[PDB]
């Protein structure tokens, strides 16, 4: 649904 | 253990600003997202927003839009909450969560700081 | 905003009595939801999430369902324990909204 971006 | 330390309780004037510190420890900052919440007394959980900590990346609620900001410092592994022009309706507990980050995606809330109430006051 | 809207607002029943609450999202949120219990005095914890899925920690006697946009947990035997106030929330799009929160307590 919803993200920030991926990390790392 | 993985924990969140938060700062301690906080009291404010009406038009002040507050600036809430949360403190991630036993696991690398930047592996998960990090959300802020918080909660009125006597009433339910309200959403506010969250960061991508090693990044900076950021989204904030609408309703708070332009009135908050969500920072870190990567250095010490430190999310920061900056709400401004406090009203007596920003009286809540706090919370800091770290989110499953499952999917590079909002996964859910699964460790959670300890909170710390902000009294708006004259 | 995506409403949430969770009932009964309260809900009392004895030690090992089966129960079940609701939560219902105004639009489809596929299976992003999620469940947080708030004990009387302490912080909310993660209980479900995917809509159907355990957090570790929790016990067997919790589940969760999802039928369209109808989500409900069930607690085969109450206990002493699971006493505070269930709070569900939508993963699915921003701002990520709160139900109003189910405040569970023991009948005698």
């Known amino acids: 649904a919803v993200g920030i971006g991926a990390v790392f | 253990s993985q924990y969140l330390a938060q700062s301690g309780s906080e009291v404010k004037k009406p038009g002040a600003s507050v600036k809430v510190s949360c403190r991630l420890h036993?696991?690398?900052?930047?592996?998960?997202?990090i959300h802020w919440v918080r909660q009125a007394p006597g009433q339910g959980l309200e959403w506010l927003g969250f960061f991508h900590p090693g990044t900076g990346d950021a989204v904030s609620a609408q309703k708070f839009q332009g009135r908050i900001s969500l920072t870190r410092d990567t250095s010490i592994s430190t999310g920061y909450l900056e709400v401004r022009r406090l009203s007596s309706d920003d009286t809540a507990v706090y919370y800091c969560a770290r989110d499953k980050t499952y999917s590079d995606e909002a996964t859910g809330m699964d460790i959670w700081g300890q909170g710390t109430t902000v009294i708006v006051s004259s | 905003d995506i409403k949430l809207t969770q009932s009964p607002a309260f809900l009392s029943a004895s030690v090992g009595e089966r129960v079940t609450f609701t939560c219902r999202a105004s639009?489809?949120?596929?299976?992003?939801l999620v469940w947080y219990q708030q004990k009387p005095g302490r912080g909310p914890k993660l209980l479900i999430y995917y809509g159907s899925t355990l957090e570790g920690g929790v016990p067997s006697r919790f589940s969760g369902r999802r039928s369209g946009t109808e989500f409900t947990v069930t607690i085969s035997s109450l206990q002493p324990e699971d006493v505070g106030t269930y709070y569900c929330?939508?993963?699915?799009?921003?701002?990520?909204?709160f139900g109003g929160g189910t405040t569970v307590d023991i009948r005698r």
């Open positions: 639009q489809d949120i596929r299976h992003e």
């Open positions: 036993g696991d690398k900052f930047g592996a998960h997202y």
């Open positions: 929330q939508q993963l699915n799009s921003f701002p990520l909204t």
